[PDB]
Amino acid sequence: GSSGSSGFLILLRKTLEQLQEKDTGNIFSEPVPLSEVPDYLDHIKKPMDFFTMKQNLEAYRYLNFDDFEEDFNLIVSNCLKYNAKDTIFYRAAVRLREQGGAVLRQARRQAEKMGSGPSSG
């Protein structure tokens, strides 16, 4: 075992929320239904969402920001790779990737400042 890494967990939980704030429509807040999209995966190799990422996070699956960030990226990618600008979910994902960036950029420094060494503070 190890001393334990909790602080990092909190930072993530707090960050994820910030991202949601941007999503006022809650288009990604929930996982896309297969009943309406039988070929969902057929185009998406790794389907990620705000709800899905949460579960993994609560399961201590994300130990390094990079990972916690990856999931999010997909949420937008799989959406921008499956749908087109014309659609809604598309324009909604673009905003998250743009604005959200600030959230992941502000929280990133924290996950690093935690350890007084490779990052000042």
Structure tokens at 71: 């999931």
Technique used? NMR
- CB atoms near residue 2 (< 10 Å): 4
Alpha helices in 1-121 (DSSP H): 7-22, 40-43, 50-58, 65-82, 88-113
The single-letter code of the amino acid at 62 is: Y
Domains of the chain (ranges, CATH numbers): 1-121 (1.20.920.10)
Task: Write down the residue that tokens 């190799």 correspond to.
Answer: 45
Please, are residues 27 and 92 in contact by the beta-carbon 8 Å criterion?
Answer: yes
Residue type for position 114: M
Looking up tokens 């709800």, which residue turns up?
51
